[PDB]
């Protein structure tokens, strides 16, 4: 029931996100979108780690983007429309009705949770995020992690090169 | 899941919310009394019996004064942000390590970091939507403050987690049965006290609400309820990081009254730093949390990585 | 300056903070806003004598 | 007039000013419904002659200073007559609430049964003043048409000049403008046209 | 997590009831023309706060974003120590923290952690 | 010597790109934010208006 | 008083001179305590304001 509610909320916020001209409307819409996407991703995995990781990522990213909102397109008009509110309300109540009259066994995800796994699975009895995150630090794929460290260092070098700090601060009509 | 659980989880969460709110009110009373006694003067003494119903005087007045309907503001975004600030500042308190099963937070550090990042989001939304220059300056100071302390707060937490081996804060209790972690982590007792004041926007890092650099910071257009929920959100954040100083550095036991005496003492320390040290500049805050705190966090993380490999071979 | 009568003809008060607030424009330039707040204090300037 | 034999009775129309009920009633959220404006007969059949408040106050001063005004009835109306639809459209043009960007539309209040129940609930549940000045007495006060009586002196007999709405109401609807957050330039928002004034022959053609 | 959703909705509901009770019991006075105006320390503003704001710490913000996704790869290895090869875990962990120290000290050497000015 | 080989009606109003590939950006005027430390501000000592 | 006494060509006694000197330095302590407390409020230190 909660998964179908998250489906309906993600659909309604995606309709809202496709229709917003103002960057702050897009920012708040993608705030509630990443909240609902973080909860939905959690439902699929045995543990709740990557939802938390994705939330730290997408709250570390738009924290910067608001500073660029206040530095570029700080002055732009909001335009509320009754058509979008009526459309979102009608679609939202229609999908809550459709989710209430639906069989929730057929609409549930086939991905296995921590309790959907059987009792005979001895790997399920370990600590909940151990075997999932193991291959980041194991022998076949530590070199991809090495490549990611060097990639992030090269990324930082690129950011320093193409954002020249000695040219001055950035604003509109600089 | 048994039906009674859900009922007792709801009851314990609501009782925790009510007790944290009344403790926020008496934390304002405690700050106004000892912060006076930091100086020569006294605290509130006349109203009520001995100043005890003084937060009730402060709460009756702020719930009856006229709501500001500002002109150039976006009122539909200005009205909602203190509600979300109090909502996350009380929602973070569900992470509290209960010896009974309140909530089975296996990922309490990540939950704490998420609500920590979201509280400053409410602060910077309330700063922008007031449509005042001092409010926008306080909001941008809050964004620069959280960009300064966020990665430093995370890496310092990881070092404590390494001493635990798990992300569940009740496992802080088993590793502190013989002694407190104040013996090992005294440089990050200082560093986590520095970060926790930057988390709660408190002196020496009070740029989001400045009384001399700006005029009340981002609270310049908030009055009579919006200011009240912003103020309780800030003081519930102060209570939460006082609790987290008591969890990590001190005993994580909750069945002793000495834990709550220690929490009142760490709250007194939070008042005590404000009454002694002057405020920084947020230029020096950004030069501090990027070149000193982050480097020390990475270095002592290396020290804990080597010590945990040394300890694991001996076991 | 006095014209010999019972009243002074003209009394001019030299404000110590007048020249300090005059050179505030050069001293406080290229600084932070918090640096301007401290500078205003460092010059000592109550504005009763400045405004006369 | 029976009890006090020589009383300067002044009859004003709807009075517009700061802290009034006339502009603040139309500008309020509770009067409009979902960014749409309900009016009786779409505002076409109601003709009003509103008066500015300092004109009424200066008429009171000039009636106090003049002893010849005792035992008289003085009509207090403005210089020009308007109908309510043109007045409301001009108010929303002054408020930067147009047809396209804000979604302002005008519809007849007689087909709306929600608004009268909302006004009755606002008059019932409020312990003091109703929210926005919304009550059925205000609905009957805006419903009636402003009619002057011939042979009864106006404010020009008291020596006071009259203030047109084009001098004050563009200033008076300045705090009630929509999108005040936008740092507009000089040519961003066009100055709206003044509203049409109804004449005598148009009024007798409308009321027929 | 379903209980956390319900208690988060209850906290949001309780805070909205608290704010609406603060709005209902507030003193209802008439709105003046210059009461609603932005404060700006008692004078006229001359400029809206929607005017563009100068950013002197753009490089520090993007370095913060890069360092935060670097934080997102450190948090696993608390759990991974007890279940992996100790040699590979130490090579990855000490090489991770030393590469971060090379990057941070190199940008300290260039002075790119100082605000543009 | 044109911008293109065959100038159309829309295209012929264009100019030639410069023979040097480098086009230096122009220096445009900037209007900074006018904030006053007005009289109510505690750092402005009560009666000072710094039009920063 | 020194302006009016220089215009009047009169001289103050030694006891009045010592009273003026003593209260001028008491007045100096008061101005400096005011300057230190004002600069501490502007910087951010709440406590030496009351302490002085
Ligand atoms: C295949 C499958 C997929 C197919 C997809 C097809 C559909 C999409 C196609 C889009 C095409 C396109 O480009 O369209 C553009 C086109 C033009 O867009 P517009 O609406 O004119 O302009 C929008 C502005 O530009 C907007 O500009 P802005 O950014 O300035 O606007 C500000 C923005 C700012 O918005 C925001 O900030 C976002 C706020 C979101 C949350 C709100 C929560 C509220 C809770 C209460 O405000 C809004 O967007 C309004 C939002 C209002 C609130 C909505 C509440 C419901 C949704 C809740 C979502 C979940 C969140 C819950 C809370 C969670 C809390 C943690 O869009 C439309 O035309 C919309 C469709 C309309 C169809 C008809 C609707 C029904 C008929 C209506 C009339 C009925 C008359 C009846 C008369 C009866 C008597 C005769
Ligand atoms: C709903 C969304 C829209 C609300 C809206 O636009 O309100 C405009 C309105 C602006 O106020 P106003 O019309 O300019 O001022 C005149 C007062 O309404 C009226 O001035 P007053 O001082 O005579 O009124 C007494 C005041 C104070 O009343 C009390 O202290 C009694 C408390 C019991 O109560 C109110 O103003 C509201 C009375 C009705 C709601 C409370 C009664 C319980 C039913 C709803 C739950 O905002 C409010 O009244 C905010 C509070 C929400 C009222 C509903
Ligand atoms: C030289 O030149 C100069 C001049 O020229 C001469 C000048 O003139 C000036 C100007 C200076 C002056 C005019 C005077 C000098 C100024 C000062 C000395 C100011 C400095 C002093 C201070 C700032 C005070 C010290 C600071 C303190 C004490 C910190 C605390 C201060 C507060 C304001 C906090 C109080 C606020 C509160 C308590 C908010 C209220 C909210 C609540 C109480 C909410 C809590 C709620 C509850 C407890 C209960 C709720 C429960 C709920 C909802 C649930 C319950 C449910 C149930 C069912 C029970 C200057 C600067 C100058 O330099
Ligand atoms: C995370 C915590 C967020 C806390 C604040 C939430 C604010 C919710 C506002 C909801 C507004 C809904 C709506 O209809 O808006 C249209 C309105 C349209 O404006 P309006 O003025 O036309 O609306 C008035 C409507 N009537 C007339 C009916 C009363 O826009 C707003 O309210 C402004 C929204 C600003 C959003 C700012 C988001 C900042 C995000 C920062 C991070 C990302 C970068
Ligand atoms: C922890 C406290 C949380 C808040 C508790 C409620 C508010 C504080 C107590 C009531 C106010 C202070 C007492 C008061 O005014 O008493 C005067 C009044 C009596 O005074 P009075 O108003 O009749 O007369 C004036 C006083 N003389 C005669 C001297 C001129 O007390 C009461 O009415 C009793 C109230 C209940 C007291 C219960 C015991 C309290 C013991 C101390 C608790 C701390
Ligand atoms: C710890 C948290 C505590 C939260 C609550 C704190 C306050 C609780 C105790 C005080 C309650 C005060 C309620 C009324 C507040 C508004 C007062 C006011 O101006 O009323 C004028 C209004 C209207 O009266 P009026 O005619 O004077 O108003 C005209 C408008 N002005 C104000 C400009 C003159 O009075 C009322 O609405 C009467 C309400 C009576 C019942 C109130 C609630 C009782 C239960 C609580
Ligand atoms: C919500 C908060 C409810 C409790 C606090 C308010 C009621 C108690 C109170 O303070 O009543 C006022 C009066 C004391 O008057 P006060 O001016 O505070 O005293 C100065 C001298 N120290 O005290 C009295 O008049 C005492 C009698 C009433 C006590 C009521 C207590 C429960 C309410
Ligand atoms: C994570 C991000 C999430 C983002 C999405 C969040 C969405 C949340 C839901 C949004 C819903 C929006 C609904 C808005 C309705 C009101 C619209 C509005 O703007 O109202 C204006 C009104 C007065 O403001 P105005 O006069 O316009 O002044 C501005 C001038 N510049 O403003 C007001 O009057 C203020 C509002 C008052 C509301 C009072 C409601 C009536 C009382 C309700 C019951 C209270 C009961 C309390 C006691 C309970 C006891 C059990
Ligand atoms: C694979 C990724 C891409 C490739 C790698 C990219 C990053 C490379 C970083 C290291 C580059 C080393 C070669 C360039 C050296 C340039 C000069 C230099 O930095 O000298 C070291 C310098 C000396 O100290 P200094 O601050 O000058 O003290 C004053 C003494 N008169 O300063 C210092 O000693 C302090 C800083 C030293 C460098 C960082 C720490 C090692
Ligand atoms: C209005 C919402 C504000 C944002 C909340 C963000 C919460 C942290 C991010 C996240 O995804 O956390 C995953 C966590 C996963 O749960 P945990 O892994 O923390 O705990 C297991 C859970 C009963 C064992 C402890 O979920 C939440 O925090 C619930 C959020 C509810 C939101 C309600 C409104 C839609
Ligand atoms: C949210 C929908 C509000 C609808 C208000 C009434 C509209 C009537 C339109 C009549 C035809 C123009
Ligand atoms: C709250 C809904 C109000 C709708 C008002 C407009 C109705 C239009 C149709 C009328 C048919 C008689």
PDB file of C-alpha atoms in Angstrom, chain F residues 13-41:
ATOM      1  CA  UNK F  13      23.193  40.223 -42.380  1.00  0.00           C
ATOM      2  CA  UNK F  14      25.997  38.424 -40.505  1.00  0.00           C
ATOM      3  CA  UNK F  15      29.565  39.662 -40.144  1.00  0.00           C
ATOM      4  CA  UNK F  16      32.836  37.830 -40.729  1.00  0.00           C
ATOM      5  CA  UNK F  17      34.306  35.941 -37.759  1.00  0.00           C
ATOM      6  CA  UNK F  18      37.660  37.407 -36.683  1.00  0.00           C
ATOM      7  CA  UNK F  19      40.821  36.010 -38.232  1.00  0.00           C
ATOM      8  CA  UNK F  20      42.315  35.692 -34.778  1.00  0.00           C
ATOM      9  CA  UNK F  21      40.385  32.874 -33.114  1.00  0.00           C
ATOM     10  CA  UNK F  22      40.530  34.580 -29.706  1.00  0.00           C
ATOM     11  CA  UNK F  23      37.677  36.942 -28.815  1.00  0.00           C
ATOM     12  CA  UNK F  24      38.302  38.744 -25.539  1.00  0.00           C
ATOM     13  CA  UNK F  25      35.210  39.256 -23.346  1.00  0.00           C
ATOM     14  CA  UNK F  26      34.103  42.844 -22.860  1.00  0.00           C
ATOM     15  CA  UNK F  27      34.153  44.637 -19.506  1.00  0.00           C
ATOM     16  CA  UNK F  28      30.545  45.359 -18.536  1.00  0.00           C
ATOM     17  CA  UNK F  29      29.342  47.688 -15.799  1.00  0.00           C
ATOM     18  CA  UNK F  30      28.309  46.048 -12.523  1.00  0.00           C
ATOM     19  CA  UNK F  31      25.786  47.434 -10.020  1.00  0.00           C
ATOM     20  CA  UNK F  32      26.547  46.133  -6.535  1.00  0.00           C
ATOM     21  CA  UNK F  33      24.106  45.647  -3.671  1.00  0.00           C
ATOM     22  CA  UNK F  34      23.221  48.785  -1.699  1.00  0.00           C
ATOM     23  CA  UNK F  35      22.839  47.806   1.966  1.00  0.00           C
ATOM     24  CA  UNK F  36      22.791  50.412   4.721  1.00  0.00           C
ATOM     25  CA  UNK F  37      23.844  49.814   8.270  1.00  0.00           C
ATOM     26  CA  UNK F  38      21.002  52.044   9.328  1.00  0.00           C
ATOM     27  CA  UNK F  39      20.288  53.567  12.708  1.00  0.00           C
ATOM     28  CA  UNK F  40      18.578  50.571  14.321  1.00  0.00           C
ATOM     29  CA  UNK F  41      21.674  48.372  13.795  1.00  0.00           C
TER      30      UNK F  41
END
